[PDB]
Structure 1
Amino acid sequence: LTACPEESPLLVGPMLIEFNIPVDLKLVEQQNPKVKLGGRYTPMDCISPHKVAIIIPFRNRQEHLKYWLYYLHPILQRQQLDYGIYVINQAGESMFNRAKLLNVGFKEALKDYDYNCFVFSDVDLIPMNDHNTYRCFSQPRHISVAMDKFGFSLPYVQYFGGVSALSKQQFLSINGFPNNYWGWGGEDDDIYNRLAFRGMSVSRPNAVIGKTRHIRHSRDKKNEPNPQRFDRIAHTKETMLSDGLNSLTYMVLEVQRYPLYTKITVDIGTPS
């Protein structure tokens, strides 16, 4: 087997993404036969250099996940990636912690395979063009550059939320993500500040290939805006050495393999 081409010849480009449609994972499982237990997939006709672990922070977002699985599996396969899908389900009902959930995904995914790249994706964002490759680059990669929710514009130049990707080394270089952001907002700006503090830049696909759709939804109880968020992002320099992968503590309550994804239910503590 030879290494897959730099660009995949299976790519179609712009695709039609809609969410009025109903989804059945059985059909999805059925439409995507190459996808093995736990949502793992490896190219059978070429060797791919990207061993990607796609991490999804999660809690009470099953319908969104269904659409995510429905659209992304066919896409990822076309991108000729050797990947796996990890849904990090937060147990309990205390304040949501997006970033800590992502750190957990990093540690748990490594237990399965030697992934070298990590894509962190909100459950409700779907790429509109398969040229927007879900892998890592020489620089941390911001993937959802043109979200319809923001009218295809970056809400602000340093925006690093939605979907992003960090190689195993880039992730390790910043001590992973912070564990101290409970509730909505800021965790992603902290991460962006971490990158800059370790001397890195952000790589992005152009605004046309980077178009992506966000599933319109309402607020989730227990993920209200975090008031101390402004104060935390202004002090990232002082807290990133101690808050992150090296201070990460959680408890896996269960690991369930579903055909389209591995679901890891975890107790990540409470704020204080």
Structure 2
Amino acid sequence: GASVHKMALLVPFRDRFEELLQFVPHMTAFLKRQGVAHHIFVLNQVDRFRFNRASLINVGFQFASDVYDYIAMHDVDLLPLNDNLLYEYPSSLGPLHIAGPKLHPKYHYDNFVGGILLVRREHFKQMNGMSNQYWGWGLEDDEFFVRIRDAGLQVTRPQNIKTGTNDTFSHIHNRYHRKRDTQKCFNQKEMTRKRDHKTGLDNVKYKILKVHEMLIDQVPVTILNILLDCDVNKTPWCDCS
């Protein structure tokens, strides 16, 4: 009756249904080939504020059952094309970053931890998850990198991968079709550039309005409809309208 690690695949989501239909069969087959037990949670942001990838991931982490002993923060549009990218339980060193800057098609800087990042449950809890202050594109992953170093942890990446930035992942994301929300308002630039010791997993404010059970060509996926709250006295750049 051997125990096996189980991965909660946490997919930040808003208006990406076409991407989702490609994601689910691709990831299900890819993970089955390497024997990784897992479940996909689509973290569907249904408030009207700007997209907040990091807070959705905090909510996903809270919701997912304790049976999942590690999470994969996973963009819905970024699909691994190399079976040697192992989505395995991370070591004691810290998070396992699958979409490394030598492998990612777009981002190539040393401490990039975006795209696909696998974290043990206990490490994520020790770090108080991710900051809640990042509304709109950018920076939430870089702040989480500092959280990793501040916890005395390190990032590990796949070794001896022979593919490179052109052929390790498919990133089907056209910048005019899916526009990156890079607006700034109020003092967003100056506030989001600073390390956030005040927010995270323990104080993300939200309601899950509905949980949907979906099957896509027989593959079960959970949809969380997440209503994020924004405190405009703290982060008014949740809405630049």
- Would the aligned equivalents of 1:118 and 1:135 in 2 still touch at CA under 8 Å? no
Match of 2:128 among 175, 178, 187: 175
Tell me the SS of whatever aligns to 2:122: helix
- Would you identify which runs of 4 or more consecutive aligned residues in structure 1 move more than 4 Å? 219-222, 225-230
Structure 1 residues 121 and 142: alpha-carbon distance in aligned structure 2, compared to 1, 3 A threshold = same
DSSP-derived class of the 2:201 partner: coil
Residue of structure 1 equivalent to 2:111: 158
Shift of residue 167 of structure 1?
Answer: 0.1
C-alpha offsets along residues 130-159 of structure 1, whole Å, 9 cap, x if unaligned?
221223312211111244533xxx510010
1:198 corresponds to which residue?
151
2:223 aligned residue = 263
Q: Which residue of 1 aligns with 2:175?
A: 218
Measure, in 1, the Cα distance between the counterparts of 2:120 and 2:163: 21
For residues 150-183 of structure 1, the C-alpha deviation after alignment (integer angstroms, 9 at most, x for no partner) is: 3xxx510010110101001110111100111101
AA matched with 2:212 = Q
Once the two structures are superposed, residues 5-31 of structure 1 have per-residue CA deviations (whole angstroms, 9 ceiling, x without a partner) of xxxxxxxxxxxxxxxxxxxxxxxxxxx
Instruction: Give the SS at the match of 2:35.
Output: coil
Residue of structure 2 equivalent to 1:249: 205
Matched, 1:96 2:51: yes
More displaced 10-residue stretch of structure 1: 223-232 or 67-76: 223-232
Q: In 2, are the aligned partners of 1:52 and 1:115 still within 8 Å (CA)?
A: yes
Output one character per residue of 1:23-60: Cα deviation in whole Å (capped at 9) or x when no partner.
xxxxxxxxxxxxxxxxxxxxxxxx53x21100000000
Give 2:162's aligned residue: 208
Structure 1: gaps of 5 or more residues: 4-46
Aligned to 1:32: none
Cα distance in structure 1, aligned partners of 2:62 and 2:56: 10
How far is 1:233 from its partner?
Answer: 5.7
Give 1:225 shift.
4.3
The correspondence for 2:190, drawn from 231, 239, 243, is 231
After TM superposition, the score normalised by the length of structure 1 is 0.74
Spell out the pairing of 1:18-29 with structure 2 (5 A cutoff). none
Match of 1:51 in 2: 6
TM-score under structure 2 normalisation?
A: 0.83
Over 3 Å counting, the alpha-carbon distance change for 1:187 and 1:114 in structure 2 is: same
Aligned length: 219
Q: Residue 183 of structure 1 contacts residue 224 of structure 1 at CA under 8 Å; is this kept in 2?
A: yes
Does the 8 Å contact 2:134/2:192 carry over to 1? no
Percent of counterpart pairs with the same letter? 32
CA contact (8 A) 1:189 1:233 kept: no
